[PDB]
Design a binder for this molecule. Structure first.
Ligand code: USZ
Ligand code: CL
Lengths: 301, 301
């Protein structure tokens, strides 16, 4: 029993974290095989960040301008290239701790573990979700750039996020490991804002199933709804539309608890229109949307 | 910016997790140097879980009855001893991945990271607190016994908890790494129940300081309180008494934000009285008590 926001064990990723220093800027790098991946804004000075031409700033650098530190050992940079918003530093030593890995781009609603790092040293691990507005509600301070998000599947680490910046509302923006930003963001010192966010409906439903599995049933009712009527309700409360794919994905949880997905939707509709009325669900007074159907199945098995 | 329930990076602990098998029972062990630590209930028979005599059960065992598995390698048991509720299996190989470590016994209110494991294989990492009633609200399924709680300080792992059992209310009970249980619990299937739980007041105050550090001040008021008046109100909401030690411990956070501890106590009294009125504090509609003053200082700017 119990239900916690659980991250993947971070050990396979801790063995890849390095410190990257270029000029006066220090941030984190991900050392996989003989390449260190880090945000390309490490080559930006105070002046550059406003209107940077990264190709022009990179051509002025030599390999020895990038100081890479793996623990107490200096890695020798023997090459450098840019791929989108990610800088790839070729090093002379392959990481002996390189796990089996893939670079994957995740969709909004999907969750992942973040290993927050400072000066190439892992500080903490937490679970978070890619918001529908493409930001993450992370916990990062100055020096956290280059920290990564990942999932683990049968000893294979799927790297999905690299931290680049904080938006004025305190939320975070970054890229996949190929340097493509999640969201309409740029790695520039310019006016940027997170768009209006929405609640990940399939995730709230998954979490309602987790509560049922753990013995919280007060929100269940005899009622059902159509998918279209539920979506007309959901759109009114800033909830993401629920598709037939989400309904199919919730199938296993529905079969285990005996509560049809549209029956759980009528419960969610009532919770949205009435509130929780002094009661809680899995120790929360808010409807939690950062657990996917897979996260619920994984933690309950 | 941001504030998350953050666990320590688990890598140093993942390299210590082994599987311990005794007869038909399989659970987790903690392999440090040439010793494997695990709950002594691994020797307990299914026919007598009510009144086991562990000394009588252990004297009937030989070293070769304990099968220890580290990854895909069998460790050879060369000695065994019981220390309180933990079994210490001397093995022929020292763990090459043994981190720098200490065994620490924590007090209620303290937090730690739990690396949930099954069959000696790490499954997830989450953050917990030792409740005032000495239980932990963990997330553990069958076979999770032997999973450990820990904190990390400058590469030193402080092991503070080993999981032993789930009480009837869904909460968890375990020992420190010397085998002494936290709370009045016993490793017997006898009528045991967690005492009435209370809110960790010093932790809620620390979390209110974290909200002020992150820019939230809506909950503050023009009032102050005496420590005694605060405690008279606190007990009425099932909050733990706030001692002068807690007030002293909150000193650094008080100095950083400019809000005196008793002024923050007046804010907490008001929040208990009025609730949140549709607002959240650090993304929560409840008053969070699983962040210590030390956790807030570690994570916040
Ligand atoms: C690792 C074994 C396990 O999964 N148990 C378990 C722990 C301890 C015992 C005894 C010491 C032999 C009684 C038996 C089984 C799960 C568990 O705690 N089940 C409930 C048994 C129980 C213990 C104490 C009081 C009581 F009333 C009943 C378990 C299940 C989920 C998470 N952790 C452990
Ligand atoms: Cl302590």
């Amino acid at each position: 029993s119990g239900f916690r926001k659980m991250a993947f064990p971070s050990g396979k990723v801790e063995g890849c974290m390095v410190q990257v220093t270029c000029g006066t800027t220090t941030l984190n790098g991900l050392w996989l095989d003989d390449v260190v991946y880090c945000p390309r804004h490490v080559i930006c000075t105070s002046e550059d960040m406003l209107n940077p031409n990264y190709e022009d700033l990179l051509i002025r650098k030599s390999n020895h301008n990038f100081l890479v530190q793996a623990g107490n050992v200096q890695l020798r940079v023997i090459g450098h290239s840019m791929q989108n918003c990610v800088l790839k530093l070729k090093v002379d030593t392959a990481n002996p701790k390189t796990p089996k890995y893939k670079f994957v781009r995740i969709q909004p609603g999907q969750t992942f573990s973040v290993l927050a790092c400072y000066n190439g040293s892992p500080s903490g691990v937490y679970q978070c979700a890619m918001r529908p507005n493409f930001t993450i509600k992370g916990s990062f301070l100055n020096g956290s750039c280059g920290s990564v998000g990942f999932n683990i599947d049968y000893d294979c680490v799927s790297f999905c996020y690299m931290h680049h910046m904080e938006l004025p509302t305190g939320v975070h923006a970054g890229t996949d490991l190929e340097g493509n930003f999640y969201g309409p963001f740029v790695d520039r010192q310019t006016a940027q804002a997170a768009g209006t966010d929405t609640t990940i409906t399939v995730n709230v439903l998954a979490w309602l199933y987790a509560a049922v599995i753990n013995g919280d049933r007060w929100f269940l009712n005899r009622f059902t709804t159509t998918l279209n009527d539920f979506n007309l309700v959901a759109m009114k409360y800033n909830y993401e539309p629920l598709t037939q794919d989400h309904v199919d994905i919730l199938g296993p949880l529905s079969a285990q608890t005996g509560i049809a997905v549209l029956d759980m939707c009528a419960s969610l509709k009532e919770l949205l229109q009435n509130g929780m009325n002094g009661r809680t669900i899995l120790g929360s007074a808010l409807l939690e949307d950062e657990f996917t159907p897979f996260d619920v199945v994984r933690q309950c098995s």
